[PDB]
Amino acid sequence: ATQGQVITCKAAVAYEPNKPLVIEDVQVAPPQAGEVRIKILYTALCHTDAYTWSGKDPEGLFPCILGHEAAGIVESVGEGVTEVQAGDHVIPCYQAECRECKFCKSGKTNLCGKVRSATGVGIMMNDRKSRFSVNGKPIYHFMGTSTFSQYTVVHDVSVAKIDPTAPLDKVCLLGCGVPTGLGAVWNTAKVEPGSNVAIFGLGTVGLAVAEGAKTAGASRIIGIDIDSKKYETAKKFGVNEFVNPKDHDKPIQEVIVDLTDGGVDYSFECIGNVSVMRAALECCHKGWGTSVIVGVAASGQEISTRPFQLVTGRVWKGTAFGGFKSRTQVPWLVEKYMNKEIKVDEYITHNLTLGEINKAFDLLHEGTALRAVLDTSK
Amino acid sequence: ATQGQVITCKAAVAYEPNKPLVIEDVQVAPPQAGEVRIKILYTALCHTDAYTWSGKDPEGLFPCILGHEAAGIVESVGEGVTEVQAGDHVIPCYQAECRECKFCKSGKTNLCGKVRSATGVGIMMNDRKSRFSVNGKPIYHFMGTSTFSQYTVVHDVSVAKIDPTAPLDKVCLLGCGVPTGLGAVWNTAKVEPGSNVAIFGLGTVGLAVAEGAKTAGASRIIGIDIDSKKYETAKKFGVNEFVNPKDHDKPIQEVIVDLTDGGVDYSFECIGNVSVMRAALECCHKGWGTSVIVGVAASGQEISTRPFQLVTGRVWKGTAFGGFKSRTQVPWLVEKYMNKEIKVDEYITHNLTLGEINKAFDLLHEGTALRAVLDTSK
Ligand SMILES: NC(=O)c1ccc[n+]([C@@H]2O[C@H](COP(=O)([O-])OP(=O)(O)OC[C@H]3O[C@@H](n4cnc5c(N)ncnc54)[C@H](O)[C@@H]3O)[C@@H](O)[C@H]2O)c1
Numbered sequence: 001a002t003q004g005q006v007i008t009c010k011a012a013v014a015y016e017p018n019k020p021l022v023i024e025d026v027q028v029a030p031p032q033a034g035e036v037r038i039k040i041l042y043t044a045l046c047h048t049d050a051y052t053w054s055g056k057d058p059e060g061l062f063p064c065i066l067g068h069e070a071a072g073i074v075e076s077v078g079e080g081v082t083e084v085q086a087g088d089h090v091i092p093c094y095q096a097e098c099r100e101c102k103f104c105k106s107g108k109t110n111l112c113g114k115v116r117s118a119t120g121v122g123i124m125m126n127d128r129k130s131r132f133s134v135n136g137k138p139i140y141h142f143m144g145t146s147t148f149s150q151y152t153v154v155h156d157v158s159v160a161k162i163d164p165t166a167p168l169d170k171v172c173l174l175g176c177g178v179p180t181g182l183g184a185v186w187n188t189a190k191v192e193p194g195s196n197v198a199i200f201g202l203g204t205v206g207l208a209v210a211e212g213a214k215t216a217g218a219s220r221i222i223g224i225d226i227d228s229k230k231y232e233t234a235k236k237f238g239v240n241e242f243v244n245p246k247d248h249d250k251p252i253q254e255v256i257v258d259l260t261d262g263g264v265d266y267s268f269e270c271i272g273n274v275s276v277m278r279a280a281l282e283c284c285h286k287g288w289g290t291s292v293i294v295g296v297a298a299s300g301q302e303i304s305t306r307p308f309q310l311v312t313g314r315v316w317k318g319t320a321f322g323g324f325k326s327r328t329q330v331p332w333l334v335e336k337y338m339n340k341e342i343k344v345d346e347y348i349t350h351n352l353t354l355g356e357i358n359k360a361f362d363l364l365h366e367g368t369a370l371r372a373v374l375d376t377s378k
Numbered sequence: 379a380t381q382g383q384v385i386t387c388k389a390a391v392a393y394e395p396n397k398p399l400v401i402e403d404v405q406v407a408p409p410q411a412g413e414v415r416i417k418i419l420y421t422a423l424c425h426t427d428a429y430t431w432s433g434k435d436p437e438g439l440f441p442c443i444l445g446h447e448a449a450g451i452v453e454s455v456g457e458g459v460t461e462v463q464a465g466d467h468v469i470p471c472y473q474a475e476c477r478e479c480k481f482c483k484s485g486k487t488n489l490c491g492k493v494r495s496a497t498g499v500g501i502m503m504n505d506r507k508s509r510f511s512v513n514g515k516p517i518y519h520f521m522g523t524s525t526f527s528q529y530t531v532v533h534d535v536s537v538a539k540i541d542p543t544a545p546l547d548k549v550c551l552l553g554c555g556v557p558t559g560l561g562a563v564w565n566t567a568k569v570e571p572g573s574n575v576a577i578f579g580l581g582t583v584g585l586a587v588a589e590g591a592k593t594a595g596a597s598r599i600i601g602i603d604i605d606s607k608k609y610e611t612a613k614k615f616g617v618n619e620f621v622n623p624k625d626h627d628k629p630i631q632e633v634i635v636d637l638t639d640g641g642v643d644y645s646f647e648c649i650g651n652v653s654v655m656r657a658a659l660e661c662c663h664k665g666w667g668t669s670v671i672v673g674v675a676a677s678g679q680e681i682s683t684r685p686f687q688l689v690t691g692r693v694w695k696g697t698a699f700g701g702f703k704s705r706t707q708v709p710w711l712v713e714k715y716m717n718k719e720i721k722v723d724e725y726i727t728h729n730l731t732l733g734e735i736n737k738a739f740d741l742l743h744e745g746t747a748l749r750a751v752l753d754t755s756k
Pocket residue numbers: 046047048176177180200201202203204205206224225226227230245270271272273276293294295296297319320321322370689
């Protein structure tokens with residue numbers, strides 16, 4: 001019985017940028033005050049993990065245990081902790097919800113700044129140290145989650161308690177991309193029935209935007225991708241027209257405006273490319289169009305447009321985790337999935353194990369691939 | 379009895395860019411269908427007139443009669459014209475409100491397509507000719523208004539009918555600057571009581587934004603200007619803290635964030651400088667801050683920022699004419715003025731004559747100067 005004991009389990013450790021992860025045995029310390037030790041059963045991976053693994057993230061610290069999309073079962077809790085207990089089923093969230101800071105109390109945002117000083121630098125608040133080590137040397141946390149491990153320790157403010165019957169190998173996606181996309185539509189844009197939408201980038205996130213728009217009652221849901229094969233998959237998620245920029249000499253924004261007789265009501269950029277972010281704004285209708293940036297740009301990249309774009313009534317916005325409050329609304333999204341009102345399973349194209357995590361990274365560049373879910377027991 | 383006749387009157391004609399305007403006798407033809415001939419009693423001027431006068435519009439048409447801020451008395455109307463008639467007091471508006479086009483009928487904007495194809499090239503829709511000439515040579519209209527004249531002829535969808543007791547030498551402001559600033563607050567931003575606002579540029583528009591904000595209930599109303607003398611006047615309009623960027627080594631956005639422990643709830647750019655437009659966005663509070671580009675604005679120049687600013691909850695917007703519908707709401711603004719609910723008189727620092735228009739141009743650059751109002755009878 002592990003309560004209060006150091007635990008030795010496997011984890012995928014990243015020692016150097018752009019090099020294979022190696023699966024080590026590691027020591028997972030027990031939870032201190034406010035902390036929650038989780039048996040992670042299933043973890044997914046996405047672009048966000050690779051951005052840091054590739055060495056391109058100037059916040060990156062090595063060595064570290066990456067991973068932020070997971071679902072598991074609480075092993076133990078540190079003192080103070082009351083919203084979860086041993087044996088609860090949980091999804092660790094990269095976005096806290098402390099319910100006590102300026103941000104949480106504001107009623108005007110899902111951002112919460114409670115633990116970010118510590119999680120941004122790969123440690124815990126309580127002692128500003130890591131809970132992970134190999135052979136007496138610390139390994140840094142990542143995103144407050146570190147889910148490429150059979151056990152992790154997270155802050156209690158980042159733990160969403162979910163329906164204990166929910167399949168852990170599916171609801172792991174509800175910690176990142178799917179709520180981002182759904183919520184970009186439902187919370188950030190607030191897309192009304194009959195709206196026309198354009199969606200730039202038809203990966204997991206974009207496809208979730210499309211499901212969101214479809215569920216909210218959108219009419220034209222126009223997808224844009226540099227890989228035309230992406231469209232056939234995308235039709236199931238609700239994309240009903242499609243444009244590859246490469247098939248046109250004109251800037252993609254002008255194509256979209258032409259196609260819609262003025263622009264779309266809402267656009268969403270789900271890639272991370274600043275040029276395309278500009279295009280997604282400039283394809284919105286004069287008077288009232290709104291563009292939402294979902295994509296995360298590289299360090300130092302800038303968006304631009306001409307101020308008349310905004311003066312003539314377009315609005316430029318962006319979204320962080322779909323504007324969802326993690327601890328409060330991730331359980332709600334689990335309920336909706338249990339009730340067959342949102343999709344999750346359809347975003348999973350590979351099921352592998354943690355042993356094969358390097359494969360899973362390569363699959364990040366297969367055009368046909370979406371999420372890979374990893375079973376941490378092997 | 380001047381109905382039906384060409385009128386000969388004084389007007390200030392711009393023959394080519396940058397040269398002093400010439401006060402000539404010109405001929406003003408009678409109104410044709412859908413048109414209204416107005417006896418302009420008072421006209422002001424702003425940057426928008428100077429923009430074309432100085433040649434800063436590579437497309438500007440010469441010779442022309444400029445002016446777009448004015449008030450007067452209808453002398454006659456053409457066929458089919460019902461909403462005004464001779465003797466009505468009116469404000470000609472550069473923003474049309476036809477009530478019948480795609481944009482007017484959307485409810486989601488104030489910007490009307492209707493008559494732009496003629497006004498945009500200095501002519502009237504009915505016969506695609508100008509109603510002005512000198513010795514038989516055509517003189518182009520400007521912005522559909524051409525108010526630098528004792529008489530002008532405009533389209534009926536550009537004419538607001540107002541309280542006949544309102545002083546014409548005051549309400550001539552309510553067709554441009556003052557509504558743009560007030561509406562920026564009340565319509566575009568929808569500022570709530572208790573909000574903290576930053577206002578960049580304390581000329582007429584910025585001062586109008588300040589009154590807007592005071593009237594709406596804002597708490598901190600922070601004015602930013604490069605000329606520290608402007609604060610004294612701004613206090614009466616509601617500005618209650620002041621920063622001059624020249625007094626600080628750090629960029630102004632960082633000064634304002636420090637000053638407000640995270641940023642303002644709303645900022646307004648009232649200058650036309652894309653670099654300050656960026657600063658206004660970047661001094662908004664994480665999570666919910668909104669920045670309004672107040673004013674057209676501007677030319678060629680791009681605005682930029684890092685998309686993280688929007689991902690983390692800031693919103694970028696802009697406004698033309700403060701979101702007001704010209705024909706319906708300029709008479710409402712005149713009502714508020716007559717009931718002492720908005721200021722107008724305080725924006726006027728000079729009363730000159732049409733004879734002295736070139737002096738009024740020079741005053742556009744005088745620091746202690748706000749609006750100049752020109753009496754057209756001299
Ligand atoms: N804001 C948030 O909170 C949040 C949360 C999760 C992920 N994200 C971001 O969303 C983005 C998408 O992640 P994903 O997992 O769907 O990625 P993905 O790699 O599965 O999909 C990206 C898609 O964009 C397409 N694409 C690439 N360049 C393009 C272009 N120039 N024009 C059109 N399409 C183009 C690719 O063909 C691919 O279909 C990433 O930036 C990620 O960082 C944001």
